[PDB]
């Protein structure tokens, strides 16, 4: 079913401390596969997934030089925008650039993205038509005009509808054994009495890929979100993901509460019930 | 693979 590729660029200014820090990270679905750090002795794009390692050194040359090229633009950009915002060169600031594409079960293009942000607030975004730009404030209205005149959108779109999908498809095939495989949630339940009248049930889900999952509670068969709580899905550090849902119930009424787990790699949804 | 670098910056 639907897959993605996304790149995440982060450029921080260090006034006096030297050139801005740049970091680039590439994901297919929820799985990173490449990285770059200006401060790393390496000075090259580096593999972070097994199934990219097999790309010849001409892949790594072009990826290194392109991403270094953007790192230098980001450096000039920081000084331009400090200019636009009339900020002093004492302060440290941040440009983030996200982009990439989605493909459908069919392998075809669905959507593209290119979005930038100054000091962690929307600055400029490419629209869904991949031909127009949304500017967040007056500074980005200048950038927009420039980018409108330069036909920059046509550059993004050519990539997003073009090499972004061409290569998403190679990645998904090359490394199909990890990327198109699912790991189902291995689930258990925990019980902590909070008071002499109230207790907590916690529904766990462990080592699942990909990271999309829906935990839900019922009470005598009926959906319950009152007195329930979800955690941010968190990485395990081994390519899988963990998440839990808690609900607070009256003491001695635990058996009436059931937990519902839905995930890509489950033919039917799973169902749990506290077992002393 | 990554985009080519922005031909014109902000």
């Amino acid at each position, epitope marked *: 079913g639907s897959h993605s590729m996304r790149y995440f660029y982060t450029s921080v200014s260090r006034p006096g401390r030297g050139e801005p820090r740049f970091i680039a990270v590439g994901y297919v679905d929820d799985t990173q596969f490449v990285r770059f750090d200006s401060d790393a002795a390496s000075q090259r794009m580096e593999p972070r997934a097994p199934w990219i390692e097999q790309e010849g050194p001409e892949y790594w040359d072009q990826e290194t030089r392109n991403v270094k090229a953007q790192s*230098q633009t980001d450096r000039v950009d920081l000084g331009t925008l400090r200019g636009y915002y009339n900020q002093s060169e004492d302060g440290s600031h941040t440009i983030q650039i996200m982009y990439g594409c989605d493909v459908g079960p069919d392998g075809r293009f669905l959507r593209g993205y290119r979005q930038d942000a100054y000091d962690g607030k929307d600055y400029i975004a490419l629209n869904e038509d991949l031909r127009s730009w949304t500017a967040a404030d007056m500074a980005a209205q200048i950038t927009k005009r420039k980018w409108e005149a330069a036909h920059a959108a046509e550059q993004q779109r050519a990539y997003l509808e073009g090499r972004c999908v061409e290569w998403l498809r190679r990645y998904l095939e090359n490394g199909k054994e990890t990327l198109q495989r699912t790991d189902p949630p291995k689930t258990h339940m925990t019980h902590h009495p909070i008071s002499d009248h109230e207790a907590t049930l916690r529904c766990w889900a462990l080592g699942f890929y990909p990271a999309e999952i829906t935990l839900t509670w019922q009470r005598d068969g009926e959906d319950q979100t009152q007195d329930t709580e979800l955690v941010e899905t968190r990485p395990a550090g081994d390519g899988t993901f963990q998440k839990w849902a808690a609900v607070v119930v009256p003491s001695g009424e635990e058996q009436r509460y059931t937990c519902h787990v839905q995930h890509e790699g489950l033919p039917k949804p799973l169902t749990l019930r506290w077992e002393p | 693979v990554v985009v080519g670098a922005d031909g014109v910056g902000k």
Partner: T-cell receptor
Amino acid sequence: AQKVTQAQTEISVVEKEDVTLDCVYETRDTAYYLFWYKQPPSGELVFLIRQPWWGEQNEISGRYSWNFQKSTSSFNFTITASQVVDSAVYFCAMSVPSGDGSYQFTFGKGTKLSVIP
Amino acid sequence: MNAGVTQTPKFRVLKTGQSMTLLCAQDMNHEYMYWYRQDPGMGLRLIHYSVGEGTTAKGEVPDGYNVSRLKKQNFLLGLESAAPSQTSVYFCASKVGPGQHNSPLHFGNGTRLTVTE
């Protein structure tokens, strides 16, 4: 492999005529820019146009027209209603990101145009 | 308006083993600067270049030339000992830098140097 090739050294046409100057680039880089420059007998080198890799096939700019064909790795230059003024040397070029991330140029050897009245 | 890429002298003649500095200055606030030479049948061979204040680096034909970039504004081409091989047309050039990768090279007028025995 960084190369630009203008297999035409010398080529002449009569005035009030079309002429096309051929240019063949060769690179494995995918984010490259193509340029043409005019060098009049004066000697100076003048920017005419830039093609981005993502850019469309034909660009127009007055009497000037270019034809970009990735398949043919070609960027051939055409002048309509050629005036003796045109008469010059014409350089094709390509820029690609070098190791430090800076874009850097490969020039063709150039092609000597004589527009004879 | 802007001068662009200004270089002197326009003309120079040296005895073998004399020295000179070709001076180049650009009022456009460009980060990259270049020194080329242009010889019949060889088009534009780059000698040295510079991507910013304080950062010379070799091109495809450095030997017998050296350069300085004390300031962003200027790029000096030194011939410490002049050889008949160095009789050529020398062309300074600049480029805005990473703010605009698609930027072309801006050339100068060019020096015409003749080294003789």
